[PDB]
Amino acid sequence: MVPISPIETVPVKLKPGMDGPKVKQWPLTEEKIKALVEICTEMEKEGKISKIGPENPYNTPVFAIKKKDSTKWRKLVDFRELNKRTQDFWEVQLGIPHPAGLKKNKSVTVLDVGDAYFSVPLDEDFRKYTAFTIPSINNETPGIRYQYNVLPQGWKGSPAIFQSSMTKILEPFAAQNPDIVICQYMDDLYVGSDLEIGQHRTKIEELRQHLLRWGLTTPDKKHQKEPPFLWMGYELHPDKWTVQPIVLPEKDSWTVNDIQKLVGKLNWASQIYPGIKVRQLSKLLRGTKALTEVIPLTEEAELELAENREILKEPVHGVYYDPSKDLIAEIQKQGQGQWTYQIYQEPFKNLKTGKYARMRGAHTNDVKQLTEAVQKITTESIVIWGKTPKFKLPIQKETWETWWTEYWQATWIPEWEFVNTPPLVKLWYQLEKEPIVGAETFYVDGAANRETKLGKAGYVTNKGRQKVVPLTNTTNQKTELQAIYLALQDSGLEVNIVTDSQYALGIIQAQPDKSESELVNQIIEQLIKKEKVYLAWVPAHKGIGGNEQVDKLVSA
Amino acid sequence: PIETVPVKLKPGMDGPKVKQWPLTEEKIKALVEICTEMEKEGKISKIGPENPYNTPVFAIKKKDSTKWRKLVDFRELNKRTQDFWEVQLGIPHPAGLKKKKSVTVLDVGDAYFSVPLDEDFRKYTAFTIPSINNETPGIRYQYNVLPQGWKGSPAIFQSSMTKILEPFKKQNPDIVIYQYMDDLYVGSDLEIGQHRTKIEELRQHLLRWGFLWMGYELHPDKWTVQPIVLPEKDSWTVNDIQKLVGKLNWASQIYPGIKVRQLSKLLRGTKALTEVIPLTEEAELELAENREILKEPVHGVYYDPSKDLIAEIQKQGQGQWTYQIYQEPFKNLKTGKYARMRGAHTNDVKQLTEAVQKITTESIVIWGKTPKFKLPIQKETWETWWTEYWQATWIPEWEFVNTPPLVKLWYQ
Ligand SMILES: Cc1cc(/C=C/C#N)cc(C)c1Oc1nc(NC2CCN(Cc3ccc(S(N)(=O)=O)cc3)CC2)nc2ccsc12
Numbered sequence: 001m002v003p004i005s006p007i008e009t010v011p012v013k014l015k016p017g018m019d020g021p022k023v024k025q026w027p028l029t030e031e032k033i034k035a036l037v038e039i040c041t042e043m044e045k046e047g048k049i050s051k052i053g054p055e056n057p058y059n060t061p062v063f064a065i066k067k068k069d070s071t072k073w074r075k076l077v078d079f080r081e082l083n084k085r086t087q088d089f090w091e092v093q094l095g096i097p098h099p100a101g102l103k104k105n106k107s108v109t110v111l112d113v114g115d116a117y118f119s120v121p122l123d124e125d126f127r128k129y130t131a132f133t134i135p136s137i138n139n140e141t142p143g144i145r146y147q148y149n150v151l152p153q154g155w156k157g158s159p160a161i162f163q164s165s166m167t168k169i170l171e172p173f174a175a176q177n178p179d180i181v182i183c184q185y186m187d188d189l190y191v192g193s194d195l196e197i198g199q200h201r202t203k204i205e206e207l208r209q210h211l212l213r214w215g216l217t218t219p220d221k222k223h224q225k226e227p228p229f230l231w232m233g234y235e236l237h238p239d240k241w242t243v244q245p246i247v248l249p250e251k252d253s254w255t256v257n258d259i260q261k262l263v264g265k266l267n268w269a270s271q272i273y274p275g276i277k278v279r280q281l282s283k284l285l286r287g288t289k290a291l292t293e294v295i296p297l298t299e300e301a302e303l304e305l306a307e308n309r310e311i312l313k314e315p316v317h318g319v320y321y322d323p324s325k326d327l328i329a330e331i332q333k334q335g336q337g338q339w340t341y342q343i344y345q346e347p348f349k350n351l352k353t354g355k356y357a358r359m360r361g362a363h364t365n366d367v368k369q370l371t372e373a374v375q376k377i378t379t380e381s382i383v384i385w386g387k388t389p390k391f392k393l394p395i396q397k398e399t400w401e402t403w404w405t406e407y408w409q410a411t412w413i414p415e416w417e418f419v420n421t422p423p424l425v426k427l428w429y430q431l432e433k434e435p436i437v438g439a440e441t442f443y444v445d446g447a448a449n450r451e452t453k454l455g456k457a458g459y460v461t462n463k464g465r466q467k468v469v470p471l472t473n474t475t476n477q478k479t480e481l482q483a484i485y486l487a488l489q490d491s492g493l494e495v496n497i498v499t500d501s502q503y504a505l506g507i508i509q510a511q512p513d514k515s516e517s518e519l520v521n522q523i524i525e526q527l528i529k530k531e532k533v534y535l536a537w538v539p540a541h542k543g544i545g546g547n548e549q550v551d552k553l554v555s556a
Numbered sequence: 557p558i559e560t561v562p563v564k565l566k567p568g569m570d571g572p573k574v575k576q577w578p579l580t581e582e583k584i585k586a587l588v589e590i591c592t593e594m595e596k597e598g599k600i601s602k603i604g605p606e607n608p609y610n611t612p613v614f615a616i617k618k619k620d621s622t623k624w625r626k627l628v629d630f631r632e633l634n635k636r637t638q639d640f641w642e643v644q645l646g647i648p649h650p651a652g653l654k655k656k657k658s659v660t661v662l663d664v665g666d667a668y669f670s671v672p673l674d675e676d677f678r679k680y681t682a683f684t685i686p687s688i689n690n691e692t693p694g695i696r697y698q699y700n701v702l703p704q705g706w707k708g709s710p711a712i713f714q715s716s717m718t719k720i721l722e723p724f725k726k727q728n729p730d731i732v733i734y735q736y737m738d739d740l741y742v743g744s745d746l747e748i749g750q751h752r753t754k755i756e757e758l759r760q761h762l763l764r765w766g767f768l769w770m771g772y773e774l775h776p777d778k779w780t781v782q783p784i785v786l787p788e789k790d791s792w793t794v795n796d797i798q799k800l801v802g803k804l805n806w807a808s809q810i811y812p813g814i815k816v817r818q819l820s821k822l823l824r825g826t827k828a829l830t831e832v833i834p835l836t837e838e839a840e841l842e843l844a845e846n847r848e849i850l851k852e853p854v855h856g857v858y859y860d861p862s863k864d865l866i867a868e869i870q871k872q873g874q875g876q877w878t879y880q881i882y883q884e885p886f887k888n889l890k891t892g893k894y895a896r897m898r899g900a901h902t903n904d905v906k907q908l909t910e911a912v913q914k915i916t917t918e919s920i921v922i923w924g925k926t927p928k929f930k931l932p933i934q935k936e937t938w939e940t941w942w943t944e945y946w947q948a949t950w951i952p953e954w955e956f957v958n959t960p961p962l963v964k965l966w967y968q
């Protein structure tokens with residue numbers, strides 16, 4: 001007998017105030033009972049479970065299923081109730097690595113740890129809560145009652161406790177062998193290095209020697225999978241990676257469910273296939289919960305889909321990470337609030353690609369969106385590679401400088417260089433800081449009756465120019481914007497505009513270049529056409545000349 | 557200190573479960589070295605999967621220090637930790653601190669590591685050193701001693717701190733010492749060279765009782781509500797008078813008796829913005845009477861310790877930032893301005909982060925608590941970058957302003 005260290009038990013508790021489960025066992029057929037007795041008799045020999053007396057008051061129902069070709073019954077213990085009553089754990093497997101963050105390991109070995117799993121003991125004080133009952137034949141004897149000594153499959157804590165138990169066992173080995181990487185996937189343990197096949201095989205044997213200390217045997221996985229490893233939806237090749245095959249289906253009838261699976265594939269593919277776009281295909285899902293609803297594709301969604309088929313026509317791949325090279329991120333504007341990007345170290349050899357969609361909002365501009373994309377990529381790059389990339393941005397240095405020096409919010413983007421890739425991001429208008437000498441002064445105002453929704457908008461100027469337009473189905477805020485629009489339409493290339501609308505000032509001072517309001521868009525188009533615009537604000541109803549004059553014109 | 561002070565969360569509240577945000581490789585490495593040493597010294601221990609709690613952690617560099625430093629963001633835990641009256645019903649925040657000529661800030665958080673934390677409460681201090689690219693499970697620790705940045709620490713340690721200082725305070729009755737979190741604030745009215753000596757002698761007294769050698773020098777002589785000032789001009793354009801009337805109308809929400817009738821009268825008609833308008837005698841008097849009103853303090857402004865303090869900040873350009881601290885709108889308790897922020901002439905976000913820290917420091921000195929900030933910045937930009945420039949062991953609360961306030965002009 002070679003002494004073997006015990007695996008440290010994790011203490012487990014029920015949620016505060018809650019007791020164990022007390023679910024009734026279902027009646028089973030004679031055949032299922034016979035099967036369960038055989039299975040459990042074997043499990044009991046292997047130490048997994050133990051018989052218990054009638055004092056234990058808890059119970060979880062057990063079942064008997066089977067596979068079609070597999071000529072055996074399968075035992076199933078439904079721990080759904082016990083899981084509801086079990087404490088929360090640290091679930092240390094939520095996130096999976098991204099392939100673009102991985103580094104090349106020429107040599108990779110796969111070990112099966114399905115048997116080490118059962119070496120992880122269940123906290124003795126918690127075992128009572130896992131009791132289950134095999135109903136007896138003809139229910140003429142007491143049912144055979146068992147409890148678990150090992151982490152049950154299907155119990156809430158098994159994944160976190162197993163993974164944490166393996167990690168702690170592997171730590172000294174990983175620490176003292178810095179030239180090897182370890183990842184466990186289901187009951188597969190994957191051990192890679194960049195050593196020669198000889199030195200690599202030696203590390204494996206050393207790892208096996210190490211794992212024997214806890215009595216863990218670990219042979220090689222059954223039917224060693226040749227490359228590429230099919231892992232978490234990817235294809236991991238020795239020198240390249242890509243997503244698994246992206247195939248767009250052909251259809252003349254698209255339902256609300258068909259469009260969701262297409263966005264899913266497209267999104268998944270966007271991490272390597274550059275230039276994927278899903279706006280026009282996402283717009284067809286704005287608000288719906290029935291999935292068979294056949295929503296016709298707009299000529300914009302068709303064009304988008306076909307643009308994706310062209311990109312998806314040929315397989316593309318990313319490379320793995322070289323820490324000795326720079327990390328570079330390049331962004332393009334695609335339109336309609338859509339942005340793409342590529343992250344690479346060598347030109348044309350992308351580590352990964354991605355996209356960024358504009359946030360929902362009534363107004364926005366291209367510089368704010370580009371800034372937001374930069375922040376997303378920054379955070380993604382820190383996750384994957386632990387560093388911020390150098391950015392190549394389709395915005396001139398002088399444009400950025402003008403933007404951040406004048407914009408009312410603090411803003412920042414990390415080290416970046418201009419890349420001349422149209423369409424370039426630009427500032428479409430800039431308001432004056434001071435009133436313009438020699439430019440006509442338009443005093444604008446608008447008003448609307450709350451009940452009738454009738455209103456007026458117009459202006460008076462220092463040259464005696466005047467206009468009032470009557471409006472229907474409008475609001476104070478809308479007439480106030482309309483008045484500014486009229487002044488822009490009716491003035492020359494330079495114009496001073498005086499408004500009393502805090503609402504209108506707040507919109508324009510936010511420097512939108514596009515709006516969900518057609519009226520704001522029209523105002524944007526006018527500003528773009530001007531040489532100089534000074535927009536001044538005054539308080540309403542104070543007797544300010546010009547403003548007082550137009551106020552009475554538009555208030556009935 | 558063998559005996560631990562029993563600590564509980566608030567009724568019907570679980571421990572914190574805050575996500576660890578991603579960290580660069582160099583910050584992870586710094587944290588691994590720091591925490592390994594903390595673990596060898598018994599200050600923290602590895603924890604198992606049965607602990608589901610988490611508080612975020614990052615790495616910084618104190619003001620003028622090349623050494624990496626660990627900072628735990630205990631904001632969630634602190635609001636979930638019971639309210640404390642450890643020794644008394646409370647320590648009255650010293651109103652004399654804000655009056656001293658000079659005030660020095662001493663980092664004494666290292667003292668906390670000598671007091672053990674209640675064994676039952678330790679699980680709530682859990683934190684994770686994240687891996688890169690999820691390539692390994694994070695390193696999971698919990699505290700065994702009073703952690704820096706935790707609300708409970710100064711309260712539990714207060715009995716010991718008061719005794720450490722009594723001999724010093726006994727001989728310097730005119731020096732005001734106040735503790736907020738991990739910091740002592742030591743103020744005096746005496747010669748800056750003499751004050752620095754007293755501070756210096758306060759430090760070596762700490763060494764004998766069992767530090768850090770760093771300091772911070774403030775001058776709360778000069779913290780007030782800056783007056784509202786109006787232009788003094790020999791010729792006024794239409795635009796000038798429109799700006800004046802708008803500013804005066806804003807001030808009339810704050811000050812009673814502000815009048816604009818005679819100034820508005822000047823703008824009778826529909827005039828070019830650049831036309832020069834001569835002031836009448838009526839308007840001159842009204843302006844003069846407004847100026848007089850603006851010299852006095854705002855009526856009925858009082859601090860209420862039961863309400864939050866609110867701090868607003870405006871970017872004024874060219875490295876200048878104005879700010880106001882208040883509890884109710886138009887009842888400013890303090891206002892100020894900042895220029896040429898240190899080492900950030902090209903970085904808006906660094907400047908804003910430094911303004912936030914300076915304003916929080918003023919708030920601690922005046923009222924003994926931190927304000928809730930209204931920040932002129934988009935959430936995603938702020939949350940990506942602020943930790944890169946943070947140098948303080950506390951962290952305030954903040955919210956984001958997305959609509960440009962018209963009042964930025966009035967504080968120009
Ligand atoms: C080691 C490992 C394997 C897998 C596979 C699962 C499946 N199914 C997943 C992860 C996350 C792994 O974990 C890490 N993997 C790497 N790098 C990789 C190593 C593998 N290659 C691909 C490859 C190489 C050689 C052969 S070959 N010719 O030997 O058959 C086949 C495939 C890409 C880089 N780095 C780290 C760092 C910390 S964990 C970890």
Ligand SMILES: [Mg+2]
Pocket residue numbers: 445446447500540541551
């Ligand atoms: Mg009006």
